[PDB]
């Protein structure tokens, strides 16, 4: 992966300004609502039995914040994403057995969440840069395979 000055600016600016708590909670809730098989991995989180329940679930909300904070670790060193996600890759692959397609789905959800948060400031170029970022992150998490 190569990052242009323009891509770095688009990524860093959105990160600085994003509400990490609210957008992280939103991304996780939407993953669980839109793609409900993902609920299987979160059975310790309690009530996931409705969209309302998922969105109000304090464990979902707190975990969502952790997740977007972790995407923040990608932002902070864009040329070291592989290393940043090595330990998380062991977790998600070897321990939790999450198929990598779900990393793609969460990336797509995050893009939609950012689009909602930023409106027209989330230009097509901004979208391009962020979809590139979530794809790089997903690639780094799906390593302990191939």
């Amino acid at each position: 992966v190569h990052w242009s000055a323009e891509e770095k600016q688009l990524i860093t600016s959105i990160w600085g300004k994003v509400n990490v708590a609210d957008c992280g909670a939103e991304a996780l809730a939407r993953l669980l609502i839109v793609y409900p098989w993902t609920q299987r991995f979160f059975s310790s989180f309690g009530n996931l039995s409705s969209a309302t329940a998922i969105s109000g679930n304090p464990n979902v909300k707190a975990h969502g914040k952790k997740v977007l904070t972790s995407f923040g670790d990608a932002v902070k060193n864009l040329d070291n994403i592989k290393g940043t996600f090595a330990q998380l890759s062991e977790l998600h692959c070897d321990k939790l057995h999450v198929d990598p397609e779900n990393f793609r789905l969460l990336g797509d959800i995050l893009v939609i969440i950012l689009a909602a948060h930023f409106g027209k400031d989330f230009t097509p170029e901004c979208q391009a840069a962020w979809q590139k970022l979530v794809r790089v992150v997903a690639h780094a998490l799906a390593r302990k395979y191939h």
Binding site: I33, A116, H117, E125, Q127
Partner: protein, 141 residues
């Protein structure tokens, strides 16, 4: 098949923003081409310059098909009959690309109508755009 609830969510969405759907289609397509540049190779006969009237014209048509599908949501296959043979038989569009365009449509909806796109509505719209993509690629399966 889409539930009664999903159908109502789709109709609620297009009944509100159907007037803008044409413009939204143009933007969705612009976003497809910029976010996923590989998709431009399906359009070597278009002017794919940013701003281009052909992109805008064509996105308008994509959105009008979605609106037709919403208006006849109980038989989307019927509604989009010609279009299906077009995409799978004539054009041989790789099925992966339908999820990319459907995602771009959601992105445009989020950009312009954030309070409309609740998680429930997002779920219903995702199912809808996938149902359309499935209809258009039906000959593959």
């Amino acid at each position: 098949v889409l539930s009664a609830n999903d159908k109502s969510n789709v109709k609620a969405v297009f009944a509100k923003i159907g007037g803008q759907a044409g413009d939204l289609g143009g933007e969705a397509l612009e976003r497809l081409f910029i976010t996923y540049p590989q998709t431009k190779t399906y359009f070597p006969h278009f002017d794919l310059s940013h701003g281009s009237a052909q992109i805008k014209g064509h996105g308008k048509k994509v959105a009008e098909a979605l609106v037709e599908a919403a208006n006849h949501i109980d038989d989307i296959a019927g509604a989009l009959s010609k279009l299906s043979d077009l995409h799978a038989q004539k054009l041989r569009v790789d099925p992966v690309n339908f999820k990319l365009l459907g995602h771009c449509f959601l992105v445009v909806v989020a950009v312009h109508f954030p309070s409309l796109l609740t998680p429930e509505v997002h779920a219903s719209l995702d199912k809808f755009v996938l149902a359309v993509g499935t209809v258009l690629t039906a000959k593959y399966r």
